[PDB]
């Protein structure tokens, strides 16, 4: 996030980090319950990647996190790799996340919810702070 | 550069489709929602993470970080997967699995 700010640690407890088998962060995601993460289809997640829950400081080797294996990847079959439309994938965890002060789920909208233009919303992540 | 070690956040406004299309034109499709152009920008490593808005006091997933400016410009709209257009698929997938 460019021109964002540091979050209060643990205050976005659904935020997960998607990492390869060496620990390299390539995408974020959101817990929607103890067994499922929603992320983008273009992230290309496979069952060799892992879901890291409870993280704040990726440079702290001591921080207490849950590295969770992925049992199955459900890429929306209508994801359009040309137009980028329908850009969503679900990850089913092989072992449930253990919810806690720093790990819990985001709510999901109903299909009919109207979120008005101009509403102040928030986005979070470990992406670049400078391109 | 390299990514920050510590989790970042930014507040930002949802944009109407009409205002988003003033920049991105017909690249904006029906399962996309735009936000930002407000001095902040999602950027590489943010993809797949949340865009949340409060609904009756509870943070609710409205977008998934998807794509945008190829240099993460903070004056152009960021584009997010529109979760209301995709949540029926989410619920069906959970129910079946």
């Amino acid at each position: 996030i460019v021109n964002g700010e540091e979050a209060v640690p643990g205050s976005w407890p659904w935020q997960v980090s998607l990492q390869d088998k060496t620990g390299f962060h390539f995408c974020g995601g959101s817990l929607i319950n103890e067994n499922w993460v929603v992320t983008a289809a273009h992230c290309g997640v496979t069952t060799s990647d892992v879901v890291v829950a409870g993280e704040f400081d990726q440079g702290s080797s001591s921080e207490k996190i849950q590295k969770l294996k992925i049992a199955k990847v459900f890429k929306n079959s209508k994801y359009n790799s040309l137009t980028i439309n329908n850009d969503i994938t679900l990850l089913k965890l092989s072992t449930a996340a253990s919810f806690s002060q720093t790990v819990s789920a985001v709510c999901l909208p109903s299909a009919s919810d109207d979120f008005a233009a101009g509403t102040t919303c928030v986005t979070t992540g470990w992406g670049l702070t400078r391109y | 550069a390299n990514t920050p070690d510590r989790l970042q956040q930014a507040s930002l406004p949802l944009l109407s489709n009409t205002n988003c299309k003033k920049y991105w034109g017909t690249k904006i499709k029906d399962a996309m929602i735009c936000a930002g152009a407000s001095g902040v920008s999602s950027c590489m490593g943010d993809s797949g993470g949340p865009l949340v808005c409060k609904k009756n006091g509870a943070w609710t997933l409205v977008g998934i970080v998807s794509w945008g400016s190829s240099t993460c410009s903070t004056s152009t709209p960021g584009v997010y997967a529109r979760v209301t257009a995709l949540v029926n698929w989410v619920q069906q997938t959970l129910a079946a699995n």
Binding site: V8, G10, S100, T102, S104, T120 | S11, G57, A58, W59
Partner: peptide, 12 residues
């Protein structure tokens, strides 16, 4: 869901 045990602080 959607209610963090640790409240976020946003400069707004």
């Amino acid at each position: 869901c959607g209610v963090p045990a640790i409240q976020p602080v946003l400069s707004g």
